[PDB]
């Protein structure tokens, strides 16, 4: 046996560490700027323009994602790929061509002895210690709902939402602009991101709090005051009308997804609801999500949200847990299998 | 051939995924005991980057046919089934059984002439107009049965050990 490497590719940033650890060794934004790689390259905004190799869960350009794995392999973790098996994450309903190309690129360029892809949301469900339950995954770019039945994502039940952390960050930019404070700088956009990280909390009900302030100093030296943006922004996640997007809210999507599944599973699925993603860790999300779902849920069954304190890297924690398991060692795609059957082996065993 | 392959692949994938989920559940209850024993991490220096079953013809079986709804009740003899057997020895007893069984639903009969597989109802001159006259399903399966050797039933000379005396 050997130690299995675990790498998680998120939209906002890439997560990577070691099997069995409770925290990833490194966290980098995974931004590529072609005139280097990483946040150090992001600092040099002049000669090279920042770009995202991964976007909306789909690889826009592989020629920079190759640099992404090179950076996360040789400059952050600094192990030996030629001997260490590598585990990678991928968003659901991924087009098959992307999976084929990813498997081929890894097994060819990196000569990884064993490479197994899995759904990031089912990896998150593998955290918190329950086999079943809806995973309301919401990354920086894409929101997912995957009713999981013994780990097998029910293929017809996945629903995709375009509501994302970046979209709400832009909404915060707009509402700060209309407040009177325009922040054109991308660094200022990240400052607004941190501001909504700290003070913003989910209102129990939009209208009751609307009829009813906090100020944080900007790092440059001036304090900014916002009164209604604290609760307006979290409700924008529930009601995308202000965002202008035709997509529904979180509660309606969850209800539709749970009703699309089989009836005999819905009883356990309601009780074992799991939430994850760095976007949805907003304070107060649990009680509101609970109350709206219970309003739309049948009265016989019990609704139980299970918000975990480790939301920001729960997917990586679950992936490391799965990789450390002994029985999981058989599931790996061996090198000889890829040589014998070609890249199309990924859709057969993963 | 591909249809039987797809059906058995779906069943095997469901079985493997539920086994993985059960393993995760067992880990989250009995403790890191079922986890791997781990190996030392070989960290390489900055210079190194400056220059820069589970094995052997595996033959995975497939689950019986109950699919998804009935299978979380885990209809098992006494233990989880063998879903991966790559050691390939089969205690050296079943190896010949495995290697000398005809592959079923073969597309090409090893380029032996041309040949043509017809419907089983076409072999029979009878039209199977009665329930009793139903010709075989021909699902291409082999049953395994152990038998007493006919040579064992044959009479054999007495074998024993002499005591103090009695020899010749």
């Amino acid at each position: 046996d050997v130690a299995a490497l675990v790498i998680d590719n998120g939209s906002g940033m890439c997560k990577a560490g070691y099997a069995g650890d409770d925290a990833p060794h490194t966290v980098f934004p995974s931004v590529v700027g072609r005139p280097f790689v990483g946040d150090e390259a992001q600092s040099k905004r002049g000669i090279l323009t920042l770009r995202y190799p991964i976007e909306h869960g789909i690889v826009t350009n592989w020629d920079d994602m190759e640099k992404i794995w090179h950076h996360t392999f040789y400059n952050e973790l600094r192990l030996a790929p030629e001997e260490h098996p590598v585990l990678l994450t991928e968003a659901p309903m991924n087009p098959k061509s992307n999976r084929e190309k990813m498997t081929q690129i890894m097994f060819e360029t990196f000569n990884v002895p064993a490479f197994y892809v899995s759904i990031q949301a089912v990896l998150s469900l593998y955290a918190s210690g329950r086999t079943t339950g809806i995973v309301l995954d919401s990354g920086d770019g894409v929101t997912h709902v995957v009713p999981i039945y013994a780990g097998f994502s029910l293929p017809h039940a996945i629903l995709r939402i375009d509501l994302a952390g970046r979209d709400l960050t832009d909404y915060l930019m707009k509402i700060l602009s209309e407040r009177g404070y325009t922040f054109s700088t991308s660094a200022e956009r990240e400052i607004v991101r941190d501001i909504k990280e700290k003070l913003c909390y989910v209102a129990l009900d939009f209208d009751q709090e609307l009829q009813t302030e906090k100020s944080y100093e900007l790092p440059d030296g001036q304090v900014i005051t916002i009164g209604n943006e604290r609760f307006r922004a979290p409700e924008a996640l529930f009601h995308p009308s202000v965002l202008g997007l035709e997509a529904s809210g979180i509660d309606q999507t969850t209800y539709n997804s749970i009703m699309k599944c089989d009836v005999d599973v819905r009883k356990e699925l309601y009780s074992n609801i799991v939430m994850s993603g760095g976007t949805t860790m907003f304070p107060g999300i649990a009680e509101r999500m609970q109350k709206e779902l219970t309003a739309l849920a049948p009265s016989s069954m019990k609704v139980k949200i299970s918000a975990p304190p480790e939301r920001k890297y729960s997917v990586w924690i679950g992936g490391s847990i799965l990789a450390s398991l002994g029985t999981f060692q058989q599931m790996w795609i061996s090198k000889q299998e890829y040589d014998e059957s070609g890249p199309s082996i990924v859709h057969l065993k993963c | 051939w591909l249809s039987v392959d797809i059906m058995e692949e779906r069943k095997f994938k469901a079985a493997s995924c539920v086994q993985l989920a059960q393993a995760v559940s067992d880990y989250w209850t009995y403790g890191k005991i079922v986890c791997i024993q781990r190996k030392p991490l070989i960290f390489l220096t900055d210079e190194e980057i400056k220059e820069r079953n589970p094995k052997d013809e595996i033959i995975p079986p497939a689950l019986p046919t109950y699919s998804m709804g009935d299978y979380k009740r885990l209809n098992q003899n006494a233990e989880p089934f063998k879903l991966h057997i790559g050691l390939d020895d089969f205690k050296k007893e079943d190896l010949v059984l495995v290697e000398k069984l005809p592959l079923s639903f073969i597309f090409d009969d090893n380029l032996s002439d041309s040949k043509k597989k017809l419907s089983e109802y076409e072999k029979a001159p009878i039209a199977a107009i009665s329930t009793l006259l139903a010709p075989p399903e021909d699902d291409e399966w082999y049953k395994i049965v152990i038998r007493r050797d006919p040579a064992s039933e044959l009479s054999a000379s007495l074998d024993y050990q002499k005591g103090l005396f009695g020899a010749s």
Binding site: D22, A23, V27, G129 | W28, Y30, G31, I33, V34
Partner: peptide, 22 residues
Amino acid sequence: AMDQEQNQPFEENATIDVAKLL
């Protein structure tokens, strides 16, 4: 970037998982 928790309530930490598994 810190490790929040642990929870290996070994109902059986005996080193023989089948001590309770069986």
